[PDB]
Structure formats: C-alpha cells, structure tokens
C-alpha cells in the first residue's frame, strides 16, 4: 500500500466521529481533496488488524464504483487511511435530503453503478454482508460507490446491525443469513434489492415501523415490500426477483447489471410504471 507522510495530509473538517477515531475531509499533497480516517493511540491488536485490514481489502480493488484508496499512514501515529473524497456523503441521507429532485433515469443510473461495483466485488470473491444505502457514497458526478469494507468490523460497527435471538441489520439481510449465518454474494443480491427500494423511494426506511421480529415473520410468510411510487415496472420486477426465498433463484449481479444497462440504453422502457397501492383515499364530488 502507498505510505503517505503525515506532512502531506491536512485534516480540515470532522465529517464522521467515533470512539476510536474520526473521519475527516482534508487535502492530500496541487493538493487534492481526500477523506481521512484515523485510529487513535491505545488501539488494541484487533483494532489495528481490523483498521489496516479495511485498507488492505480496498487496496486490492480497482473499479469506478468502489471507493479508491490513496494510501495509509502506518509509520506514524495516529494511523490513517486516506481515500478519494465523495462530496455528497452517504446515499441514504443524500436521497432523504433531495426528495423528488432526480429523474427516474438518474435513479436507475445510480442503481446500475452500485450493481456494477457489486458485480466486481462478487467476482473478486468478496461478500459485503452490509450492503445498504447508508454504506454507499455519492460524488459530485452522482456516481455511487460501495464503501464499508472489512471482516468482523463491518457488522460490529454498524449501529443498524442488532443482536438477534448473530449481529446483523435485519431489514437488509437475506433469510439464510439471518437464519443460519450463510452470507454469500446471493445474500448481497437480496440486500441490493432493498437498496433498489431505498433509492426509488428517496430513502424510505424499509418496512417502515415494523419491528425486526415483525420483519422476519412477514418475510417468512411471503410478504415483500410494496412498489414505490412512480417506479418503473421493470425495476419492481427486478427487485422482487432479488427477494426470492430460494437463494439459487435470485439473479446474479451479472444479470442485474445487464438488465439495468439495457433499460438505461432504451430509456422509454422506464416509462411503464408499476401500479402503486394507495394507502390514503381522497374523494371529491
Ligand atoms: C477514509 C476512509 C477510510 C476507510 C474507508 C473509507 Cl470508505 C474511507 N472514506 C470515507 O469514509 C469517505 C469518503 N468520502 C466521504 N464523504 C462523506 C462526505 C460527507 N459530507 C458531504 C458534505 O456535506 C457534509 C457531509 C459525509 C460523509 N459521511 C458522514 C457520516 O457518515 C457517513 C459518511 C461522508 S467519507
């Protein structure tokens, strides 16, 4: 991994904070904007392994839809991981703050980028385990990149991941991963279907206020999230197939990328909408 000297790094603004380090926006020696994650002195061996392990995993990847690693500071303290800076932050928050501001075509293009990143990861034999809009970042070209890499650190550090009766983010997780700890690229496909629903709804919370146990029971009884408003039928047809109980029946990421690319290349295909089930009746004479 590229080792960066600390005199090349200027931390400008804290953008994320944790107990054991913070995430900063800063500049890297003209100088270029970067994001900087630190690990404070006193860290344990496991914290060091997890922290540098994230940088080790990201250094093995070179794709447009995967956050790019610039380098690390490991010879000085605090240790740091330096990556490209994504100017619009996390996708879930971004969509909630930009409700209704994009075209259907722009939304579908976000999903194609996420899918192409996930296709790369799956083909690299990397199972993400925590695919969700909160773990995708967005830049000033609207490009979405998969973020949040590691081993045990990924689900450990995610506040949405809860201890079940394994520590997992239930509303995003496929049934076999909940039931018996089977995390594969096909469980990431289920997650991706939830991310398709998050994007098309501008960041609605999956299953709204149902509790985690209620979500598991609904999924096991066969219920699935309803169509978003203004959602192309083909998009809904795709997210439903990501949510097949039988893992072998789900599309692979290659199928998902192929379908999305064909829809974008014939954008009239996105004008056919799935019916939306209204929850409110308004009657006027
Ligand atoms: C530095 C680093 C080390 C290991 C792994 C990674 Cl993926 C990274 N890189 C990064 O975390 C980031 C790269 N670009 C970033 N942009 C960014 C930019 C922003 N902002 C964008 C401008 O408006 C203020 C917030 C927020 C965030 N957040 C803050 C809350 O936690 C979720 C992300 C993130 S963070």
UniProtKB/Swiss-Prot annotation:
Annotated segments matching region Mediates interaction with ARHGEF16 and ELMO2: 2-285
**UniProt keyword terms in alphabetical order:** Angiogenesis, Apoptosis, ATP-binding, Cataract, Cell adhesion, Cell junction, Cell membrane, Cell projection, Differentiation, Disease variant, Disulfide bond, Glycoprotein, Host cell receptor for virus entry, Host-virus interaction, Kinase, Membrane, Nucleotide-binding, Phosphoprotein, Receptor, Repeat, Signal, Transferase, Transmembrane, Transmembrane helix, Tyrosine-protein kinase, Ubl conjugation
What switches on expression, per the entry, is described as: Up-regulated by UV irradiation via a TP53-independent, MAPK-dependent mechanism.
Cytoplasmic domain ranges by topology: 1-285
Domain Protein kinase, first and last residues per copy = 9-264
Summed up, the tissue specificity of this protein is: Expressed in brain and glioma tissue and glioma cell lines (at protein level). Expressed most highly in tissues that contain a high proportion of epithelial cells, e.g. skin, intestine, lung, and ovary.
Record-listed ATP binding positions: 15-23, 37
> Where in the sequence is Phosphotyrosine found?
24, 126, 163
Its localization reads: Cell membrane; Cell projection, Ruffle membrane; Cell projection, Lamellipodium membrane; Cell junction, Focal adhesion
Report the function annotation for this chain.
Receptor tyrosine kinase which binds promiscuously membrane-bound ephrin-A family ligands residing on adjacent cells, leading to contact-dependent bidirectional signaling into neighboring cells. The signaling pathway downstream of the receptor is referred to as forward signaling while the signaling pathway downstream of the ephrin ligand is referred to as reverse signaling. Activated by the ligand ephrin-A1/EFNA1 regulates migration, integrin-mediated adhesion, proliferation and differentiation of cells. (Microbial infection) Acts as a receptor for hepatitis C virus (HCV) in hepatocytes and facilitates its cell entry. Mediates HCV entry by promoting the formation of the CD81-CLDN1 receptor complexes that are essential for HCV entry and by enhancing membrane fusion of cells expressing HCV envelope glycoproteins.
Provide the family line. Belongs to the protein kinase superfamily. Tyr protein kinase family. Ephrin receptor subfamily.
Q: Which disease is it linked to?
A: Cataract 6, multiple types: An opacification of the crystalline lens of the eye that frequently results in visual impairment or blindness. Opacities vary in morphology, are often confined to a portion of the lens, and may be static or progressive. CTRCT6 includes posterior polar and age-related cortical cataracts, among others. Posterior polar cataract is a subcapsular opacity, usually disk-shaped, located at the back of the lens. Age-related cortical cataract is a developmental punctate opacity restricted to the cortex.
Instruction: Output this protein's name.
Output: Ephrin type-A receptor 2
> Which species does this protein come from?
Homo sapiens (Human)
Portion of the parent chain present: 605 to 896 of 976
């Amino acid at each position: 991994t590229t080792e960066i000297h600390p005199s090349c790094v200027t931390r400008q603004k804290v953008i994320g904070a944790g107990e054991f380090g913070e995430v900063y926006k800063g500049m890297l020696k003209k100088e270029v904007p970067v994001a900087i994650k630190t690990l404070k002195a006193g860290y344990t061996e496991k914290q060091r392994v997890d922290f540098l392990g994230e940088a080790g995993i990201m250094g093995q990847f070179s794709h447009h839809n995967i956050i790019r690693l610039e380098g690390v500071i490991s010879k000085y303290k605090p240790m740091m991981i330096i990556t490209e800076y994504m100017e619009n932050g996390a996708l879930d928050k971004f969509l909630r703050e930009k409700d209704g501001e994009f075209s259907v075509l722009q939304l579908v293009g976000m999903l194609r980028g996420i899918a192409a990143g996930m296709k790369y990861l799956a083909n690299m034999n990397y199972v993400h385990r925590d695919l969700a809009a909160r773990n995708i970042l967005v830049n000033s070209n609207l490009v979405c990149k998969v973020s949040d890499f590691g081993l045990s650190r990924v689900l450990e550090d995610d506040p949405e991941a809860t201890y079940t009766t394994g520590k997992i983010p239930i509303r995003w997780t496929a049934p076999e991963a909940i039931s018996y700890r089977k995390f594969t690229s096909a469980s990431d496909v289920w997650s991706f279907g939830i991310v398709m629903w998050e994007v098309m709804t501008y960041g609605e919370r999956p299953y709204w206020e149902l509790s985690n146990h209620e979500v598991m029971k609904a999924i096991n009884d066969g219920f699935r999230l309803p169509t978003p408003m203004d959602c192309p039928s083909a998009i809904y047809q795709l997210m439903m197939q990501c949510w097949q109980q039988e893992r072998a029946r789900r599309p692979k990421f290659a199928d998902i990328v192929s379908i999305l690319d064909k829809l974008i290349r014939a954008p009239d295909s996105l004008k056919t909408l799935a019916d939306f089930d209204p929850r409110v009746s308004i009657r006027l004479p």
